[PDB]
Amino acid sequence: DLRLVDITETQLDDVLRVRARSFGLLAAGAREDWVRDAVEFVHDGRFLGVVSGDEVVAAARIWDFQQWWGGRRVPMAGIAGVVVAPEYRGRGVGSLLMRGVLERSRDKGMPISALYPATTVIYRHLGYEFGGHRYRFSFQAADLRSLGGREVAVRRAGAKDAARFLELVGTAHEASRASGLLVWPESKIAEWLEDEENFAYLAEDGFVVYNWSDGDLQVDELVAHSEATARALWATVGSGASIARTVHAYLSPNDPVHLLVEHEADKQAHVQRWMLRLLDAPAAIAARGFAPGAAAEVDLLIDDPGVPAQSGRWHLSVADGTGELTPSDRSGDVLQLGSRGLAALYAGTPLAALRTAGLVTGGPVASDRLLDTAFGGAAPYMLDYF
């Protein structure tokens, strides 16, 4: 009796009721902000639901992201707000919903999907697997304050600097061949920079955005193309040390700040994980950046009953930072993988780990080494939660 639907504006009240019984209550002001954001999802076909009769019983949204992979931007479906009414849980409703979400993401031409799961079981069944991390580290403000770079011009930034921020990030991630980071629309970055609770500063070759977190400061993002600039931006955040003793920062464990500060980040850190799924393997491969110098001619046997279109035997050809995935008619021993193994592989997870987890099977070890290096590079991470 259940039906998958496109959520409309007039159903948002019912979606909010299912939400209140899933995540918790919304404050009266936060509810108005939620509805405002829900509208753009509705009118772009990125708000799916399940109805029982005329009752909305489950819902999920799809962010129109791009995600960095090996220094290139790949269209990505970010799944958010997955909720099911308590009395409709444990009956296949969430799965029905998510299958509809996957189909909608494919139709919109998004070759990959990511999410932060509250429970892993349902998403693993649908073929998602952990693909990367989000790290929060804690530093002493007084240490950051003293980093110097006082000669660098740093000015307060605002909504009007959105395009410049995008440019700066793009240059950085392309040079480092970064993986995992989200690309937001210029419009959402403008909102971000316009929020008066966010403190943003811009230098010629870097920027920082930070805010208050319970008496301490929290860095949402710092980007810097040179040492003097990194120092000046960290020093700007740390300049509040007379009040904030601690600054937490979302960044990679490979961030240069660890090499710059005197006092090591606190041993206690936050490490969260996000999941990835491939929806259109050839398009995802064609869009991914590959490791400089890496060459590979490898066959892959994909078994994905969730997305039958990418099932079957493929040939993976990688050269000069580019890869292509084409149908193969060969017969030798071949690496066999399901949706989970495929996602984890694309995300750069070591074949050794994937074999031990049982996500990948068969194939010569010679293939393993070439795949490892091909998908290798910086560890995927994200700065944002969604």
Ligand X SMILES: CC(=O)SCCNC(=O)CCNC(=O)[C@H](O)C(C)(C)COP(=O)(O)OP(=O)(O)OC[C@H]1O[C@@H](n2cnc3c(N)ncnc32)[C@H](O)[C@@H]1OP(=O)(O)O
Ligand Y SMILES: CC(C)(COP(=O)(O)OP(=O)(O)OC[C@H]1O[C@@H](n2cnc3c(N)ncnc32)[C@H](OP(=O)(O)O)[C@@H]1OP(=O)(O)O)[C@@H](O)C(=O)NCCC(=O)NCCS
Residues annotated within a binding site: 82, 84, 89-92, 94-95, 118, 123, 125, 145, 242, 262
CB of 84 to ligand X, least distance (A): 4
CB of 304 to a second copy, least distance (A): 17
Backbone angles phi, psi at 203, to 5 degrees: -115, 170
Does 117 contact ligand X by CB under 6 A? yes
User: What sign does the CA torsion over 190, 194, 195, 201 have?
Assistant: positive
Does 92 contact ligand Y by CB under 6 A? yes
Does 344 contact a second copy by CB under 8 A? yes
Does 2 contact a second copy by CB under 8 A? no
- Amino acid identity at 174: E
The CB-based long-range contact list for 214-219 (8 Å cut-off, 24+ gap) reads 215/244, 216/141, 216/244, 216/245, 216/246, 216/247, 216/248, 217/141, 217/244, 217/246, 217/247, 217/248, 218/247, 218/248, 218/249, 218/250, 219/247, 219/248, 219/249, 219/250, 219/251
271 binds, among ligand Y, ligand X, a second copy, none (CB under 5 to 8 A by kind): a second copy
Alpha-carbon distance of 41 to 63, in angstroms, equals 8
Report the residue from 3, 91, 155, 156 that binds ligand Y according to the rule CB under 6 A.
91
Does 241 contact ligand Y by CB under 6 A? yes
Q: Which residues pair with 115 in a beta bridge?
A: 275
Pick the closer one to ligand Y by CB: 267 or 330. Answer: 267
Q: 337: number of CA atoms within 13 Å, CB side?
A: 28
Pick the closer one to a second copy by CB: 138 or 311. Answer: 138
Report the residue from 51, 265, 278, 382 that binds a second copy according to the rule CB under 8 A.
265
Report the residue from 98, 207, 349, 383 that binds a second copy according to the rule CB under 8 A.
349
291 binds, among a second copy, ligand X, ligand Y, none (CB under 5 to 8 A by kind): a second copy
Site residues for ligand X per CB under 6 A: 22, 82-84, 89-95, 117-119, 121-122, 125, 145, 239-243
